[PDB]
């Protein structure tokens, strides 16, 4: 039955949308992690050099 295969795939293709949303959420999680990591490393490295200068 072509219609039953169409009903099955219309459900099953939602897993590709879920995996794509999870991949985007992993890139967003990396964006949040790398924001905090990069800001912290830059600020504390320069702040130490500033405290050493003074």
């Amino acid at each position: 039955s072509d219609a039953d295969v169409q009903k099955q795939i219309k459900h099953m293709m939602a897993f590709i949308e879920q995996e794509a949303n999870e991949k985007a959420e992993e890139i967003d999680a990396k964006a949040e992690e790398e924001f905090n990591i990069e800001k912290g490393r830059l600020v504390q490295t320069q702040r130490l050099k500033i405290m050493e200068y003074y």
Partner: protein
């Protein structure tokens, strides 16, 4: 040769979640294959068998499907004697077959 029958419009490629597979079937068994490929694995869209050409014995088709289907699909194709012959519009290989057919004939002369 794939270079005589492969054309770009029959393929779904250059994608993260999508694949094109290629399969050979006998001309009698093709009448089952037209439906039966959809039964081999999950994640197969209906009406996605696309014949590149047919001959005195057989058919070759592309199958267009989601990436999760492919390894179960190919293995169960072989277990049912449907012969996998993957060639994903390989422009370098079709160009090599054409240029070398011309070259080796010319160089033999």
């Amino acid at each position: 040769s794939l270079a005589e029958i492969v054309k770009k419009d029959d393929f779904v490629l250059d994608s993260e979640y999508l694949v094109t597979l290629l399969v050979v079937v006998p001309k009698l068994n093709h009448n089952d294959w037209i439906k039966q490929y959809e039964t081999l694995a999950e994640m197969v869209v209906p009406r996605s068998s696309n014949v590149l050409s047919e001959d005195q014995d057989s058919y070759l088709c592309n199958v267009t499907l989601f990436k999760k289907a492919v390894d179960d699909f190919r293995h169960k194709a072989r277990e049912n004697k449907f012969i996998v012959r993957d060639f994903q519009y390989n422009e370098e290989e079709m160009r090599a077959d054409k240029e070398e057919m011309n070259r080796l004939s010319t160089d033999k002369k």
